[PDB]
């Protein structure tokens, strides 16, 4: 037995998000729905097709009939963005999960990144190592590219940059690190971390 779900569902705020779960004769099996936000454990939002555990808002409603069960989210808000998994589990079938539907809410306002740049600590330098740390937070359109410079020249080799990761507020965060020797660090006049977001760039500089 196998349950199918659409990969994603896009909805504007205040409107109604409809998530579907396909399975042969699913209408005669008890469907549960689980919500999972990034970095968090799953939360039961619907059991026995339509029942809500204590504290789940009535905006979340469940239906089940025929070959399709549905999770309806009325008056959607940014806090509802998550991965939603359907499940069947009852007397007549062992637990099966759907593939998961990610809900994204449209029209969120773009946000330019905040950039914080740290030089190597004195502790790290006396351990004969050096790391520049470029922390990027609170950008929304979703992605960034990071470039590094020593004085005015592009530095690659030593650069590692994370994928963007969803924050609490549905904005995104990322990090970029430049590894170098203590001699590289003290030989130049400055280093810069340059973060490009939607054709515009924020540059921070540090010096020894």
């Amino acid at each position: 037995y196998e349950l199918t779900q659409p990969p994603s569902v896009s909805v504007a705020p205040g409107k109604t998000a409809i998530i579907t779960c396909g399975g042969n004769n699913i209408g005669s099996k008890s469907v549960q729905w689980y919500q999972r936000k990034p970095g968090q454990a799953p939360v039961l939002v619907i059991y026995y097709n339509r029942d809500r555990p204590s504290g789940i808002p009535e905006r979340f409603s469940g239906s089940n009939s025929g070959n399709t069960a549905t999770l309806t989210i009325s008056r959607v808000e940014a806090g509802d963005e998550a991965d939603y998994y359907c499940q069947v589990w009852d007397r007549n079938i062992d637990p099966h999960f759907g593939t998961g539907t990610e809900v994204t809410v449209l029209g969120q306002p773009k946000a330019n990144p905040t950039v914080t740049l740290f030089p190597p600590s004195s502790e790290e330098l006396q351990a004969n190592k050096a790391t520049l740390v470029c922390l990027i937070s609170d950008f929304y359109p979703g992605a960034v590219t990071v470039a590094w410079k020593a004085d005015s020249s592009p530095v690659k080799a030593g650069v590692e940059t994370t994928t963007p990761s969803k924050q609490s507020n549905n904005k995104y965060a990322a990090s970029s690190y430049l590894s170098l020797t203590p001699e590289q660090w003290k030989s130049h006049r400055s280093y810069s971390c340059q973060v490009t977001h939607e054709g515009s760039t924020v540059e921070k500089t540090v010096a020894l």
Partner: protein
């Protein structure tokens, strides 16, 4: 209220057996179907199996040949052993409480209401390595209009995860812990930063509390201007 706590995260070597436990606190193990579920990106949620209070088990057919679940009611614990692991078994493993609900003499249903927090398991032939923690001192003067950004760099550890708190959990406002970067050495580094009022640098001590459970190491680093 019932709480479930998985055993410590860390690595399992390829071809060895992954062994996890879950401790149930705040409640009894009777009546319930104690379940293991795992998650990894693209993999969604996968049910592994469950053990009823008294010892009976039920397993995912695709894993039944490699999986044993058992229960120790004397310690309010149940366990998972997954043998002959490979990279395909890298995942976050959850314990959960399965509940049965009777509808009629010939129909009942189940749901998983209480979940553990998840434990991150990495299948890897590499070695566990505890972190080196360095302070990220706030600049001598603010460049943000009156706030100071300070942090801790947690360098060169393996495997995931690391957790960071500040002032033993008393400081939560303005804390941002960034997901780790994987360096070309194959080790992870991450940073946690807190933004505080500039004046508090004279009146408040700032200490980041770094926990790397895989290496049984905790570091409390004072961050001074």
């Amino acid at each position: 209220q019932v709480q479930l706590q998985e055993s410590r995260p860390g690595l399992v070597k390829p071809s060895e057996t992954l062994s996890l436990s879950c401790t149930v606190s705040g409640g009894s193990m009777r009546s319930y179907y104690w379940s293991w579920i795992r998650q990894s990106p693209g993999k969604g949620l996968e049910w592994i199996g469950y053990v009823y209070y008294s010892g009976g088990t039920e397993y995912n057919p695709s894993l039944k040949s490699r999986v044993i679940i058992s229960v120790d009611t004397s310690k309010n614990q149940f366990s998972l052993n997954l043998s002959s692991v490979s990279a395909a078994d890298t995942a976050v493993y959850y314990c959960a409480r399965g509940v049965s609900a009777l509808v009629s003499v010939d129909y009942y249903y189940y749901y998983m209401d209480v979940w553990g927090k998840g434990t991150t398991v990495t299948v890897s032939s590499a070695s566990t390595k505890g972190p080196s923690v360095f302070p990220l001192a706030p600049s001598s003067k603010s460049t943000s209009g009156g706030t100071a950004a300070l942090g801790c760099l947690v360098k060169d550890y393996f495997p995931e995860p690391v957790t960071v708190s500040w002032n033993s959990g008393a400081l939560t406002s303005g804390v941002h812990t960034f997901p780790a970067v994987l360096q070309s050495s194959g080790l992870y580094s991450l940073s946690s930063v807190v933004t505080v009022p500039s004046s508090s640098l004279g009146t408040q001590t700032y200490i980041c509390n770094v926990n790397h459970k895989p290496s049984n190491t905790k570091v409390d680093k004072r961050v001074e201007p």
